[PDB]
């Protein structure tokens, strides 16, 4: 909770540069919002009620409260494959990121509905086809019937 | 508990109340398949008098049985639901179910005249009378 690369695939040692964050490689967005658990120490916001976001997801019998939780990890196919795989399950609820110049980041005070948000993955390449830095990404739709 | 209450010939008037639990084995080694066997058996009018039908199931077993007091289908199917820890970290139950129809008896005479002293034989078209698997199933005359 006291470093900026939290909830993303990457390392808890980091910098500030030009680029962004040299610690984040990977991360999961929705609604072009970072997906984080409510932890740390800006996370007392009850919103509506009087009943805090994080004890708000916990009540709807929800463990997957951010990336951190599901247990998501990239792992390389083969030992000299160069493919990298990671899998995880949509979550019904989840906590919007009020501010995230913020660290910890400050969490809202009330859960929301995944259904008709954006999914989004984006990848950081360290290096590129010349060997620059350069971010790419891939998009989806969360339905509901 | 088994059983039926007044006349039993309502359905809401028969119950059945059991749970089974399937011990399966590993196939091989290092085979992750493992095998078991289910098998019922259909209640009829003179097994459902006697304590010993229900008391005869084996209830934890590779090679369970269990009792049906009317047809299940559909909704109401036997089904065998497995809890389970998936390759994306979430326990997500896999099941399956198959209906355990009842049967219509026939009941024939091989002639349409006899006379005296003529061997008579009557054969009787149940499925629901087999009620196991292993041994030959015999019914017996009254004599009380």
Same mark, same amino acid.
């Given at each position: ?145 | ?59 934890? $077993? &590779? ?9 299940? /289908?559909? @909704? =109401? ?6 809890? #389970? ?25 091989? $002639? &349409? ?9 009557? /054969?009787? @078209? =149940? ?6 698997? #292993? ?10």
């Amino acid at each position: 909770n006291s470093k900026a690369t939290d909830d993303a695939v990457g390392s808890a040692t980091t910098q500030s540069l030009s680029f962004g964050e040299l610690g984040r490689l990977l991360d999961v967005t929705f609604d072009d919002v970072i997906w984080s658990t409510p932890d740390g120490a800006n996370n007392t916001a009850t919103g509506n009620d009087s009943d805090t976001c994080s004890t708000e997801l916990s009540n709807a019998g929800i463990t997957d409260t951010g990336l951190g939780a599901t247990g998501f990890t990239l792992v390389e196919t083969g030992a000299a494959t160069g493919v990298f795989v990671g899998d995880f399950q949509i979550p019904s609820f989840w906590c919007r990121v009020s501010d995230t110049t913020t660290t910890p980041y400050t969490y809202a005070g009330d859960e929301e509905t995944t259904t008709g948000l954006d999914i989004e993955v984006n990848y950081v390449d360290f290096r590129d086809a010349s060997g620059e830095i350069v971010e790419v990404g891939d998009s989806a739709g969360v339905r509901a019937n | 508990s088994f059983g039926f209450t007044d006349d039993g010939v309502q359905s809401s008037e028969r119950f059945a109340n059991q749970i089974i639990r399937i011990e399966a084995e590993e196939t091989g080694d290092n085979t992750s398949t493992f095998e078991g066997s289910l098998e019922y058996v259909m209640v009829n009018q003179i097994n459902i008098q006697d304590a010993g039908t229900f008391s005869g199931i084996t209830p934890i $077993a &590779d090679d369970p049985s269990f009792i049906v007091i009317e047809d299940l /289908t559909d @909704e =109401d199917a036997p089904r065998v639901n497995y809890n #389970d820890l998936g390759a994306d970290g979430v326990t997500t139950p896999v099941s399956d179910q198959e209906e355990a129809p009842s049967h219509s008896g026939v009941v024939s005479l091989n $002639a &349409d005249s006899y006379k005296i002293a003529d061997t008579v034989v009557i /054969t009787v @078209e =149940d499925l629901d009378l087999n009620v196991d698997s #292993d041994l030959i199933d015999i019914f017996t005359v009254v004599s009380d």
